[PDB]
Amino acid sequence: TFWEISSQMLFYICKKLTSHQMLSSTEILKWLREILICRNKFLLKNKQADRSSGTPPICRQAQTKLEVALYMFLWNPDTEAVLVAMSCFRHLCEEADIRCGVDEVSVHNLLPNYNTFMEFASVSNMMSTGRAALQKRVMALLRRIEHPTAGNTEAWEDTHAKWEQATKLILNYPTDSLQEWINMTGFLCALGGVCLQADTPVSKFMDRLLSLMVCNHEKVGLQIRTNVKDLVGLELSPALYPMLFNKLKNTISKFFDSQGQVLLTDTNTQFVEQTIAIMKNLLDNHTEGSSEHLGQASIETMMLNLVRYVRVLGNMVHAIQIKTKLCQLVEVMMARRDDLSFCQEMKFRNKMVEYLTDWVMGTSNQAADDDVKCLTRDLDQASMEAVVSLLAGLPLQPEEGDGVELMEAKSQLFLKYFTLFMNLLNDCSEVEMSRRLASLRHCTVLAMSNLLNANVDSGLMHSIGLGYHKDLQTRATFMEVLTKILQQGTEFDTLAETVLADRFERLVELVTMMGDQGELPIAMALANVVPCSQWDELARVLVTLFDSRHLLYQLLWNMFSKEVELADSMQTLFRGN
Amino acid sequence: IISSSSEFPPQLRSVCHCLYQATCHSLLNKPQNSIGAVGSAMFLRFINPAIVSPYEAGILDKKPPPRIERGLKLMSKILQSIANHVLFTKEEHMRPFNDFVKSNFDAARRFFLDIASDCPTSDAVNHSLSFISDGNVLALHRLLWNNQEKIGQYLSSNRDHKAVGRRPFDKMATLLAYLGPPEHKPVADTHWSSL
Amino acid sequence: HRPVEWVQAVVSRFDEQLPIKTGQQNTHTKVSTEHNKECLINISKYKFSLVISGLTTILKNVNNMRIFGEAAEKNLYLSQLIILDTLEKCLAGQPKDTMRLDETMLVKQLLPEICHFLHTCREGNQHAAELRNSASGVL
Amino acid sequence: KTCLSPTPTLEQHLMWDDIAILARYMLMLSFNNSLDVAAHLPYLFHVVTFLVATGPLSLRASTHGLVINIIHSLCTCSQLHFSEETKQVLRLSLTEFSLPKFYLLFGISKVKSAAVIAFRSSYRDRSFSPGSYERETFALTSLETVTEALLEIMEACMRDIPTCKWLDQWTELAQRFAFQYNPSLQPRALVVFGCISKRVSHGQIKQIIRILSKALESCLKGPDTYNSQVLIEATVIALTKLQPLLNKDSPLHKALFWVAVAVLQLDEVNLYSAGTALLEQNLHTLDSLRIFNDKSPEEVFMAIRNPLEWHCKQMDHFVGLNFNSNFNFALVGHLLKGYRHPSPAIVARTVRILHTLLTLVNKHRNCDKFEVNTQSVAYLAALLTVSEEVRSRCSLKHRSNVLLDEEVLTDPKIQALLLTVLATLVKYTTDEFDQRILYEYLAEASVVFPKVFPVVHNLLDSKINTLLSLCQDPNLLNPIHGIVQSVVYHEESPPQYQTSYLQSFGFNGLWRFAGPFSKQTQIPDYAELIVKFLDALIDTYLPG
Ligand SMILES: [Zn+2]
């Protein structure tokens, strides 16, 4: 009767809390927390006396409802309510142990997300702070819900309906309500992964979410756009990138009519301007597992279309600032190129350089005769940095619009840019703001050096003139890059087999230094310092290298010893990430 | 599985011994059997996955028929019970099979012991391949250069007993600077791929 | 000598945590100021005369204080409630030494202050009820 | 020729310009092996050491470039036949000297390239215009790092070159300036002589120890201190390197333990820092000779101090500490000031000295290296808040063995001093973790040893009073309440031991010696006995 009645009480009370907000809601939670504590002991003694412990449908039907009411309180504005809810996860986890002592059989099967639940306890045991700071930790854990669950898949939907209706009222009306909406919005994003998997509520959530980035509402429209950009970019679950990019690309895809003619619109101009910050923030943030998700989607088409709209936007103080950020966005896009997926990297990079060269015009602020347009100096300065990243290791390839010998086309293409850089180089001369020219001059010199390295054969002749340049500083840089070319081998030539093998022979010895008593300081120290994102690369190199040196046993003994000694649950950690 | 003890690769044999030593060392400081944990862990995580889904591993091009697949799934549960020496609890469906596993408890132990009996130091086992491994080396140099500062900080915290001049921290800065910055990575024709 | 000066800090810090006195956020969730109470109560076991004498002055100072306003009246009511509650615990906490040589404090320091509360005290309908209830137990 | 007219610094010497101009000539001649290194290498280092980090930023970058070119000439010299193994060491050395680490050593930090500063384009149209006369200081420890890096290079070459005399020539040059009075070069000429010397004689040691007596004498007599405050640190540093070369059966191997102690008493960060470095290797050197195998540190050091005990007794009176009464507690008060040293590197050095001393006294008594006894209690109080094993192996009873055991600590003196150490460690320390651990062990002492506790009121009076008024930490405030209650609980009885009980048997200055380093750096004015103490040591242990 105890479980028949006690469980039946839980189902009734939990449903009431979800039904609507009440003044004493924060008080029922504290009392309801104690109810769980007072029924765990009875199960413990009951199991000890007689295992026989029953789980009728109400016990299952009410165990789910307990979770469905613990998640919905994580975003509750009251700090105490969320803090109590986090502490309430201990009782949910501890209940698993009593029912089944063996963790793997049931604790990791009945409660798939057991490990994350344990983390909530540590976070709760921290100094109180504003809801914004707390939400960061809460939303971080909400993004780590790997296993879908009935409570998770139903808590996401239950609050999704509540969030949607709240949003309509705010817009329909021609501040405390918004703060709750912000928490609901952030909460509804971090836990999207569980609800993942055509038409689906998750997809419909994105559509409305994307339809709010351009929300023009006189009353509170600015705040909505100001916050959706901040949260969606910096808080979205990495498991939702393949859906965001597709929807983001499709929205842009329709901005261009037939025959590739831009249809300039203020909303479209605002939409692209917001897309730049979101993509930059999304790419800026490095997290574990984000790289794995970036590969699935193809960002080439979106980037190519994005520049065209901004390219035709025209010239103005506002448009220059947008172009400047776009140049910086492409620069950030070249730091994760290994993580990203490209169908044709060469064909895409060459076009981007072509589209960017149009904007790099030097000495255009003096002709304008207005100091207000000094931003063009930054835009040109920013443009060079983007082109430098694009040109790093990029062989030239001319577009096949006309039928000519490839060798001639490449040589013409090379001199097209070589002349362009030299013209800008002359303007940066001090005789013809010093930091601007000094910084810009350095970038312009570096850009030419990278271009020569990619294709020496087709550009060596055109670059010989730099030897006798008018700037002594420029001549030194050219000689250094030229010196490296000589050291490099034109062909394989067994040059790396001899020079690089001997040159890098000592490298393995330092990394493979047999620390006394198997200390291996380099390997042990390197393990912790290396970011988690590249652990895949680190693991293969360490295993491969030590095997070649016949010292694999030493590395395994040291690495495993620290993990096993640190945590008595050696098996559990090994299966964990 | 028991018969093919010789076919086990030498690389895994070393890996299994390290776990055996780790468990033995863990037990010493603390009737758990080190071999039992090693055997159960290895079988569950290495041998078992292939049996359950050979198609996913790539053993068979075509997915096995569902009826054949069910036998494989049930086979794994019976085999795993042998390693753990656990009888059927609230599992009357499969309880009759409990008799068979009793005989095979000893057989499973012998296979685990053979791999776990490898010498801690491979003095007898020698393979002087000494391959150049040029491709792997390139990644190592790039990674060290990227984390040159960070790796130094960890060394700085410790090693106060003896000066670092003759220790990796001093050598790393000197040698790494001599090699110079790493070259740019080459482009990839293939699409993004992972292990 | 030195411990004598230490006691004053314990007594003095108690006064600075009276609601009528500016809170200054020194309570530290009231655990720090409550810990001060425990030490003072324990000290009374060996320094009953000293601890009692300090409390009487604090009560007299609070009694001889004019403040107006709902918050002000509540602070004084709560302030004296802690003092009366604290004083009664020390008396009860003190072992049955049966030392009857406290007449000096009782006649002048203590009795007049308690006798004031025992009056009808119709200024506060709800405050006087609690103070009389607490004072009666002490008496 | 600078000896004829000694000057406080080279830049103030009349012949400064003559040396400076001659440096530019050598700089230009270094390139392309225009200076014959194969015959003049000994004389190149000898002059490099006297120029490193001296002069205007232009002149300081010049010396760095000179070294960079001297090494290159060696690698590109055909007269010498260095094996391919040796050449690798030189090539690595060339890269090392180009690292930012050496920029600070040479005093050219914040300079991207030395060559740019060294050369000026418009040197024909206009003359140089020196400025920014503000000049950084130099530390004799930096000279050792450079002085030993070069010695590595020289040693490698001499392996190939047969019957080379480079090392013998370089030593002779240093030996002339080492034992000659020159306030501008002698400090630099001593730090290098020890780094390169391979043998030492009794007469040489006597001069080194007898130059310190005059160096100390000059400081107090005259008002010029900084000039003579660097000759003292150099004398100790030189001796710090010559002990490992001393005879295996020399008395001074043990008599160099009191000189280091006498230097820590001068209340100077550099002198205090240098003294510890001498002590650290002094213990390590003595270990290799197996001198504490059958004796305790007190037995050895106090046995050699006996012949001149009368002079030592006077010094102990003024400092306010005694070693005859308790060696292991007077030898730890001097080692508690290290916690107040600004450099985080000297704090770790004294910790190592504590571990080495702890392992030796326990090994003498075979007490597991972590047992609690009368002898090994002083070294554990200092290590309680820095050594985890000490905290774990000695835990408070009211949470293996538990600290504060009254079975062995049954003497008022042996337990009064341990309270003095605990009070001192909290008087100046400012750390939540350290204060928490120390106060928890102080409450237990109040009840376990009530009789001796009241002698520690003044030390804890001020800090407790301030903490009680304003502290708001329940974790740190709870132990305080227990202490106050214990004090009143154990009150009402006449103090058997007053606060001045420590003054009764000499240890009146234990708390004073552990205070922070004085900003007004000045000689304590009682060093006149250290001079007499040193003089007696020479006569007794260096007859001739
Ligand atoms: Zn593709």
Side-chain angles (χ1 to χ4, degrees), chain C residues 18-21 62-63 65-82 116-117 121-131:
Chain C
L18 299 184
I20 57 101
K21 302 303 185 206
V62 175
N63 277 15
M65 186 187 189
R66 286 186 169 181
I67 57 176
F68 307 93
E70 181 62 13
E73 287 155 19
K74 181 177 180 180
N75 297 335
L76 195 160
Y77 153 82
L78 181 57
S79 165
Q80 289 179 340
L81 178 60
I82 295 171
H116 139 278
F117 300 89
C121 184
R122 305 171 183 176
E123 297 189 346
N125 59 334
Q126 302 303 134
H127 295 185
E130 307 304 63
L131 302 203

Side-chain angles (χ1 to χ4, degrees), chain C residues 1-7 9-10 13 16 25-28 31-32 35-36 38-39 42-43 46-47, chain D residues 457-458 460-462 464-465 467-474 477-478 481 484-485 487-489 491-492:
Chain C
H1 190 273
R2 279 64 181 83
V4 180
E5 186 179 5
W6 286 343
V7 174
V10 178
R13 175 163 183 176
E16 299 149 20
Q25 203 264 339
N26 196 354
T27 61
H28 205 73
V31 69
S32 302
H35 287 347
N36 170 80
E38 297 181 359
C39 178
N42 276 315
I43 287 168
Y46 312 97
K47 285 173 161 51
Chain D
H457 289 158
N458 299 34
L460 300 170
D461 175 18
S462 186
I464 284 175
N465 191 336
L467 276 172
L468 286 172
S469 180
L470 314 178
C471 183
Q472 312 187 15
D473 178 307
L477 190 59
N478 292 325
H481 289 327
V484 182
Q485 296 177 12
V487 173
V488 295
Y489 182 15
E491 207 155 14
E492 310 152 335

Side-chain angles (χ1 to χ4, degrees), chain D residues 32-95:
Chain D
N32 192 37
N33 194 338
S34 35
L35 287 164
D36 189 13
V37 299
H40 301 293
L41 195 62
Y43 301 89
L44 290 175
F45 297 165
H46 171 256
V47 297
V48 166
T49 65
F50 287 17
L51 292 175
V52 294
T54 43
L57 185 74
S58 303
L59 184 59
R60 308 215 278 195
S62 317
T63 309
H64 179 237
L66 174 50
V67 168
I68 292 285
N69 285 315
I70 294 166
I71 303 167
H72 180 253
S73 301
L74 288 166
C75 299
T76 72
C77 180
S78 318
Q79 179 170 343
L80 309 178
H81 300 285
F82 298 149
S83 59
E84 179 53 32
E85 206 293 332
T86 294
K87 277 184 289 179
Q88 300 302 339
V89 176
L90 294 168
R91 295 171 192 163
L92 271 48
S93 307
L94 198 66
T95 313

Side-chain angles (χ1 to χ4, degrees), chain A residues 298 342-343, chain B residues 191:
Chain A
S298 303
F342 295 98
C343 293
Chain B
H191 282 85

Side-chain angles (χ1 to χ4, degrees), chain A residues 338-341 343 346 488 500 510 519 525 529 540-541 544-545 547-548 550 553 556 568 570 575, chain B residues 11 17-18 23 30 45 120 127 131 134 136 141 144 147 151 154 159 168 172 179 183 187 191-192 195:
Chain A
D338 52 333
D339 303 336
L340 304 177
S341 172
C343 293
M346 291 295 164
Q488 298 178 349
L500 161 145
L510 178 58
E519 280 173 358
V529 300
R540 55 174 62 268
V541 174
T544 300
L545 178 58
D547 175 64
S548 175
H550 321 100
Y553 172 87
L556 299 168
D568 55 0
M570 60 191 176
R575 319 314 120 178
Chain B
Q11 311 302 348
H17 182 96
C18 294
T23 298
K30 296 290 176 56
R45 309 299 179 180
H127 53 287
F131 264 98
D134 284 315
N136 185 23
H141 162 47
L144 289 170
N147 306 22
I151 65 94
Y154 189 97
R159 215 80 220 183
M172 177 59 68
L179 296 176
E183 291 186 350
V187 292
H191 282 85
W192 180 85
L195 174 56

